[PDB]
Amino acid sequence: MDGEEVKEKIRRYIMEDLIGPSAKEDELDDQTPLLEWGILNSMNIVKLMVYIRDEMGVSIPSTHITGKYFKDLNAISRTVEQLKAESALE
Ligand SMILES: *P(=O)(O)OCC(C)(C)[C@@H](O)C(=O)NCCC(=O)NCCNC(=O)c1ccc[nH]1
16 A cells, blocks of 8 residues: 555556557556646546545545646656645644
8 A cells, every 4th residue: 555556556547447448558657648648638537536536545636637747657646645645644
């Protein structure tokens, strides 16, 4: 539950849903910019919100919905791990 072993699973879900059954595994990477390559555009982007809400118990707010936080997996990494740090009351 370290975040990192979860973040790689996000990529698996990205290809299966966010791309679909025509998942171009070749181009799949963490440093591959999803927003920039039109992999994520609104209709599918809500899946990132609800996924992480179900997974790491944290949903990215509508104020943090921006292409600069959603650029790639590592962009989402910095956003999702910071939010778990800000949500950490412990
Ligand atoms: P869909 O996932 O519903 O995106 C809705 C969107 C964020 C475009 C809408 O609520 C909105 O606020 N539109 C006005 C422009 C805006 O706020 N842009 C911010 C950057 N946009 C995005 O990061 C983004 C994500 C998804 C679509 N645009």
